[PDB]
């Protein structure tokens, strides 16, 4: 009678969360954390938004029960999510073509979609950008879906390699899923232009792909409406699509696990039938979603006063990151870098895709206490006026 | 192209949550909800516990960040959970043989265990009592495991058919998983005696089963410590086991999704190896767990004044249920019931397994607006002094 657990092989360290554990153990003073994608303020803290504290006070005073939510969550949360994604007067909403489930974070939204697709459709293959968020492959693989990669990044020109993207998707077949980052591509910070989105939408329709949009950073590139332009170009042309969205980043609600999975089908009767199977997949996973974080978001989005506060707080975050992008480039020059880092100013969202080699990233960590992901992704939102100079001195030292 | 969603078949309604939806839509003022397992107070509401409101006020005023929890959640939540399960000074805890992940509810803990087993071991088969919670089969099937049923309930004598149980489980092979309800069996309310638990534990080690305890009602049978005797008898003999537990019921925290999956192995090295793969399975599901509910539970359990308030609130809930069982039995006789219902007194937890037929349950709902599950399971915790009379008049009318 040998033990059931004896033949288990240890899992590898998560490329992002294993980094964050190393950083916590490091005892060297002055260490700098440019790893995980969270927003830091000017003092290096990860604060709760004021709009969120105000919403949480309202809930504390007014909640009378913790009775279970429905499988698909708070209804108002679903409607505000759809207006945010598709626009206040979208035909998708007027025609009742979309159904939304509240999920535990953006990850949970991706997993719900993966389980739904694997069990209820003939989808066998998901295409994701190379590079992408490392956990994408794991999520779809957990449902038994094959994941293939398409080309995306021109590391020479620090731009979208649109020609290779198109050519590498040639073998994606009708009924395959193709995953797009809605904005603030993780890790490159490089998003298609409106014209490029429009070309992709047309191509997707011709080849019969099922688009799946991952929206984790709406509002961090240019603005809430502008960041949804690519999705809305797809939505104007497609009968069917799926959107996984997260409120972790744009509400600073990381650990309350607030996200949404939105299904779009050709008509109301089809999406309702499909959605009943999405609800069945949720029920066999976590039963029904956590209320606190989604209640906060729904409270903020449906109160005009609280929403105006939140939109300003999100603008402040976006602008601080853009200021740090510019200060990073300038200080690298000041500190003696001969490599041209000006492409960082053109990149969107929390990160810059710097180009450092695995070996240089390792040197930064072991020698200077500066923590980036081994792909060379750095969280610009982790840079402050106080840590910018030592950070840049370290980078110049390993170049 | 023909759409990917066009041929999806609609899912059937959930036997518990579908009933709850019918109940909400029912326009009759006298309707009575005895379906889903939630606690009502004697005024018919589903309240937030006072310990919980106090903890939530502390969190509101002292939380400074929503930064991601680790994959396995709040550390003190894990330690307090192990202490509740195994006892203040257990050898499992002192030998560092146990690891706990905070999960989204008890359901989430079951799915995490199921995914972990399916993807990392040779387990193919899970054995569940007939009857059981209906969602058990769905969770394990969705992870790819086969579900087999063992006998449990003697319907003629309203008792545990221990001989039938032992005999059906002789077909369970070594390396199979056998699922036990820790206490307050759902739906029958009939638990093993301590002697019977000891017999099963011995039989379990000799046959090589991997036990999986589902603990959703610790504290509702006799007491926090007493209700864990059966699990602690298993833990004294086995090298390996899994406990999925829930704080939904005993904290009235249903919609915040607070549960735990606890892994036990033969030694510290093996459990840390196995737990690394459990974390991988979590990372590809919801990434990390929701903070608010678990923070509430950890604040209560780690503060002596709050814990004392909570333990009294749980005692009051348990005792109110016991008063309703007796009142239910006495009132049935007063309303003209032909049959002996005294076996209801011998059942533990929120429910009673009434023995009504599906056709009688259907009549109760359609003619009398009394909502019970089609199995005849009734939620005694939904009974109040004000609804007992019409409730019992309706039951007598359909006998
Ligand atoms: C592209 C992308 N998708 C999904 C996620 C996961 O978001 P969440 O924390 O809400 O699960 C992230 C970041 O965490 C992300 O960058
Ligand atoms: C035996 C059993 N296991 C698990 C659960 C699920 O607990 P939770 O709501 O926390 O997911 C329940 C009741 O809901 C239950 O009765």
Residue numbers in the entry:
A (entry chain A), B (entry chain B): -2 to 396
What does the paper behind this entry write?
E. coli aspartate aminotransferase (AAT) is a pyridoxal phosphate (PLP)-dependent enzyme that catalyses the reversible transamination of l-aspartate with α-ketoglutarate, yielding oxaloacetate and l-glutamate. During its catalytic cycle, AAT undergoes hinge movement to switch between an open conformation, in the ligand-free form, and a closed conformation upon association with substrates or inhibitors. Using our approach, we enrich the less populated but catalytically active closed conformation in order to increase catalytic efficiency (kcat/KM) with the non-native substrate l-phenylalanine, leading to altered substrate selectivity. Steady-state kinetics reveal kcat/KM increases of up to 100-fold towards this aromatic amino acid, resulting in a selectivity switch of up to 1900-fold, and structural analyses by room-temperature X-ray crystallography and multitemperature nuclear magnetic resonance (NMR) spectroscopy confirm that the conformational landscape is remodeled to favor the target state.
